[PDB]
């Protein structure tokens, strides 16, 4: 149908505002401590630490995939990475000190694109 297209025109056009988002995000991570997985090799008990891992790369293919269907799906998941971060690793490390900063400097561009998804629907 005509419908379920102007809808796959729109998550479509989400998946591209989600983008451009996503790409700002880890502009925030320079160290590139978030863009990857938690190695399992080289730190093989962190799901016993952490149930839902989360980084960049993992976001990225979900969304290529068009598997956000909002902006609060994919708020979740940037969230995972920061709270992830936040538990397993202690107050005085670089890691910690990094998900602070990338939450606090993430907050700004997650505050324009709520009103930007509302405003554009
Ligand atoms: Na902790």
């Given at each position: 149908s005509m419908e379920q297209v102007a809808m796959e025109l729109r998550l479509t056009e989400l998946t591209r505002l989600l983008r451009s988002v996503l790409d700002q995000l880890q502009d925030k991570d320079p160290a590139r401590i978030?863009?990857?997985?938690?190695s399992l090799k080289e730190v093989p008990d962190y799901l016993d630490h952490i149930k839902h891992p989360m980084d960049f790369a993992t976001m990225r293919k979900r969304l290529e995939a068009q598997g956000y269907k909002n902006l609060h799906e994919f708020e979740e998941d940037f969230d995972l990475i920061i709270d992830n971060c936040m538990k397993y690793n202690?107050?005085?490390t670089v890691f910690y000190r990094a998900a602070v900063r990338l939450r606090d400097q993430g907050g700004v561009v997650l505050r324009q694109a709520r009103r930007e998804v509302d405003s554009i629907g």
């Amino acid at each position: 149908s005509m419908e379920q297209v102007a809808m796959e025109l729109r998550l479509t056009e989400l998946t591209r505002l989600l983008r451009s988002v996503l790409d700002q995000l880890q502009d925030k991570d320079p160290a590139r401590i978030f863009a990857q997985p938690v190695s399992l090799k080289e730190v093989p008990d962190y799901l016993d630490h952490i149930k839902h891992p989360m980084d960049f790369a993992t976001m990225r293919k979900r969304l290529e995939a068009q598997g956000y269907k909002n902006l609060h799906e994919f708020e979740e998941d940037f969230d995972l990475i920061i709270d992830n971060c936040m538990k397993y690793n202690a107050r005085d490390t670089v890691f910690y000190r990094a998900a602070v900063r990338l939450r606090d400097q993430g907050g700004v561009v997650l505050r324009q694109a709520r009103r930007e998804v509302d405003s554009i629907g």
